Amino acid sequence: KRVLIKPLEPLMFRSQGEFEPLITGSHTAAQSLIIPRPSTIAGMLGYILFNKSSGTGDWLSDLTNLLATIYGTFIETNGEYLFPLRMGNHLALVDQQHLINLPTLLEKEYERREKGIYELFYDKNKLFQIINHQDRIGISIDKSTRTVKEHYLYSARYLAFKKEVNYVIFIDNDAISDKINGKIVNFGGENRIAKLEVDDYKVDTSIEEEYYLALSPILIPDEALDNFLDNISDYVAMGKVDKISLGFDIANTKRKEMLTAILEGSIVKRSIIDFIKNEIKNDLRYRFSKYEKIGYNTLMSLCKLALRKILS
Amino acid sequence: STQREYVFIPITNSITIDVKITIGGSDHITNIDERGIHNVLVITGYAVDEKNGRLVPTLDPCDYVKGILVAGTPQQAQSNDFLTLKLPANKLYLIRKKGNISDDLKIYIPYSSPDARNSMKTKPVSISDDTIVNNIIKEVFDKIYNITQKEKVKIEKVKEDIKELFSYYALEQ
């Protein structure tokens, strides 16, 4: 039901020039997303269950034919459950104790809510107590000159963990949660390893609520983009929306797609669900059901741990 | 049936005489097992009256009161002003859930008057001066959690969660 992914070492999920809250000592040609986009966890699971029955497909039909509905993804220290929280180019990790009473902060007085925001992202934000952003420089060496091979100097910012951290995702059909338990895998990045460990931890799976939290990027069809980016206040209360590339398909070695989304950790209003459902009602809807199947459109109740997809 | 009793945890010595049933049955939902306190319930929209601190009703949700859940019925000297109700395992928000609940529970809450004679201008409480922590681990976690100084030698941990996990808004009035 619930899957634990503990990184066995620092690991990197490449990101295109997206994170600039951190006062970097030196530069680096590639940052690392804090929480792996659901494309990465999807593909990581698909890698284990891959056969030659694949055939043709837009990397996702074939992918969706392998697994259940992945729900979302969030941090997990010893006992604690950390959750992503973003206010616009400003990310944070916080526990449930501070999600439960956000709406008031999001609607309270000017200076009271400024205080609340400040102490959220600075004081109670447990990010820097978990994640250290170590930079690695890499080079290659021509066996002839036995010196650096010219033009080959890459710099990557890895994600180093100060304490035992897992990634918590929920799936179904334990018919696969058997062939997946206790398996180390090249969890997304340049040849990094993480361990899978599935347990049994039942959670709620449906709830209606005023405010929700986006544990995974909510994808925008771009037919709504025009008629959505004008009234954000109706849908999102706090977070960040921007173009993201889905990933990189291994089938035919190409960048996957691109579409505006709401990044992992973002306070959306219940006016989201009706919007998305009552905006796309055709082949678009089937495409986005394929999307959400691999953990894309996910909310989480700010009060108790309960998830829900959008189009289902 | 089934009954628990939430005991508020302020910085005040309002913990000595509010309990009579120290164990009663067999089961506590909160457990300090080699990782600190767990399964901690937080209540939003309430308050304190630290002069004989009992839970005061408010309407701000940012006000929180964190404490421990134990089993029983308090003192047989209540049920006239104490908030009594039954909530079956899901209308509670626990911190560090370790076990599960069997969907049946009546809750007893130390409740006081709405106090409509002075504004409840409220401010949190930071758990400092570990002397009070030294006394509060004994006052409740030794008169209910008698297993203290029987299995837990790592008292250095059972106090840090009291420095970091527990707080509440105080009315100071």
Add this chain to the structure above:
Amino acid sequence: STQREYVFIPITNSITIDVKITIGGSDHITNIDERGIHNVLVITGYAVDEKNGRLVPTLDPCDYVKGILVAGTPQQAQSNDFLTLKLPANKLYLIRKKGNISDDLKIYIPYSSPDARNSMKTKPVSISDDTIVNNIIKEVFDKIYNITQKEKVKIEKVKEDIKELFSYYALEQ
């Protein structure tokens, strides 16, 4: 000089009558000094056919077998089918190299027939069911090493290692 005798270590009891020499000289490659069996050799690409399973040679590198290299000429009624040979002592796949080798040695191997009449679908075989091991301590380790049940007080050590140090692949057909 000296001549060594390598025996396979299956889970099957095809081992009781395959050798004649317990010591012959005074030494063996595989030693046991209060730390387990060491200098064990692993034969790659060869498999067993346990019903008179000998070193059946496959062409798969992952296929292998593990065995004990002691000195000996088997029963002086064979070698019409054995891999009698002389290696320069380094081309071996020795595990737990504690002792150093004398640059040359003559070896006898129980070698089986190719038997080209069916698929050789091998299977990884692990030596479990310690009963079949507690006897192999007696069936091969006591019929050879008299120091056994003379010096070894940590029998659990020489018992736990064989389960995990020794493993092989078999046709099982």
Add this chain to the structure above:
Amino acid sequence: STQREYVFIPITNSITIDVKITIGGSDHITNIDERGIHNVLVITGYAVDEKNGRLVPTLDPCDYVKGILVAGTPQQAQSNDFLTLKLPANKLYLIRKKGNISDDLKIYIPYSSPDARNSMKTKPVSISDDTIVNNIIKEVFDKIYNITQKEKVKIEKVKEDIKELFSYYALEQ
């Protein structure tokens, strides 16, 4: 079913008359398709015996022989010293694979006895002396594979690639 007989590719002229069948069936695994050679069967633990060229099974996992795979019955003077075996086409270590294999093949391997009279200090030998490459092409890549010099004009390529692709270990006795 289909039977193949692996033939090694050394630098020496032990290659002319060793097999009775050139085609026999209608296909062979080793293909030469405008990119070089494919599906080269590599066998470890065996050594080359250039004088009467055959593959002596050694006990070193570092001794490998690299030759092409062709279907045929040996010279109708063999099955005495040819390692007749049947493998399911997935236990073969193939190099630069292009296509799939028939999921089972009966294989014939030129074998020599261990010759327990001289230590097997096997030594590596590569394919050099380009005219040796040429005359072997005239002995194998034209005799068993008439495909060359028929549609092939890219002979320099299938020369420079075999200049690296094939090697082995020889007994050097």
Add this chain to the structure above:
Amino acid sequence: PYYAFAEPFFIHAITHLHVGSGSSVEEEIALPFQRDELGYPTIYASSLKGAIKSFLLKEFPDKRDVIYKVLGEDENPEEASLGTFLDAILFAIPSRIIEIDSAKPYVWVYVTTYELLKKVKLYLDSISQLSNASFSNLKNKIDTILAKEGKNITLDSDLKSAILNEDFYVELEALNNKIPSIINAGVPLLVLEDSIGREVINRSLIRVRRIRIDRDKKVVETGGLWSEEYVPMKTIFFSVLLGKESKESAIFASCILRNLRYVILGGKETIGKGIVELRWVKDVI
């Protein structure tokens, strides 16, 4: 699974080591070592794998294809790699000792901390599943030691007290049991607690000021003065080489891995900094 076999191994610094990284944090060092996340030295899996590949591509030149397959290709990334090193975790550094109140006198001992032992645990745990050769004895040693977390414990009897690196005094609570030697060095092994183990280790790193001299007048050249940090001799790192079954990983462990034992890691090979010995922990315990 696509990870069939594992291969833990220790990395014994024969000479000093320098696995560098550009001047980053410079606690008055111009060429620091590779930190872990906490501050301990470690060898990135990138450097480790690259150096091991470069070494094998010479001492086994004929098998260039097997090395290519198991450790990735150079210009043909049509196929991924089938082996993968984990970041080499620091396991035990040497340290000079002035042992007060002890029987067998020592001049140097090994030193680790519970943080490093937890990082080693993580590896050994996450590996034992596939590892048909379960290192139950070694992992049992490591999780027995970790029971005493919070005390300056020694994996011997006769220390009871010492002065490590001529600056830090420790009262070594012994081991209330007997534990076999993790390695074949008769030298003891102290497992200090943290924040005191950070000092004894931080002080056991050879920081060196270096210069460049004008070839013609035996005088320093301007701007030619920097500092470097080496990892001392006899230091021990820990790592695992993972792998997915390929029928050439079989030969890569049959011929290659069991054969090689010395490798050149890190930079400054001309200064003789980087000869290191690889000990596979499957033949020893």
Add this chain to the structure above:
Amino acid sequence: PYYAFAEPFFIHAITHLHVGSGSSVEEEIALPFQRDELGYPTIYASSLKGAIKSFLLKEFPDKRDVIYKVLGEDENPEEASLGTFLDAILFAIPSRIIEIDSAKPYVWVYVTTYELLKKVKLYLDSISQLSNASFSNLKNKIDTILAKEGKNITLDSDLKSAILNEDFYVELEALNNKIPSIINAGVPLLVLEDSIGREVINRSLIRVRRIRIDRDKKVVETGGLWSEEYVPMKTIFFSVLLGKESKESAIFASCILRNLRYVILGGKETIGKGIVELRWVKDVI
């Protein structure tokens, strides 16, 4: 053959040599010698290389292209050097002696410890495994010594008791008086145990208070008082010169090294410090 040629060589100090890492804070000696990772003195191969190189560049001005190929260009780097130096291990240090009973009475003697010989054995083993050069006889003469550890043995004499550095009474033990001498000198070699060997060696160094006097009034310049630290004459270090296969390296090892006896290591050369004879191991042993 990662290294074509491998040349272990001893470093006999002809004068007091001072290769000194300019100290840190806690300058108990203002200018100390270069300390090993376990406290002993050593010559970091960086300075060893830059001293042997700046020398050869003068002595052989016609082969300034061979040198540059093996010891690396300096005016503009375009590739790596093919020659490496290993850090110089202290092999034996002189110590003044007061022998209680002895046939022929001595005044000084060579003192080594067991950790130093273990390091030398590590060097020899790694070098034998990285190259063709096997040093059978030296490895034998060293590990026959190491067979007797924990005892202050003496190599080629009958002493049984002495007072090294007039401060440390030592009770000796005869190995064989049959084992050939590693050094070639009538002076005995003592292999102390490192408990005592450490402070014996530490006493055998040379602290020297120096000053700077005003030429005007013949009185000490203010602030001009400090303390250096030399290693005495006759002390013997040990390093290896390694080389990767080439043709410039063949000339280097066959012409340059065969005429290399006296070099000037270290600093403070204007005063007597620095001169060094370096003897080649395979040459003498």
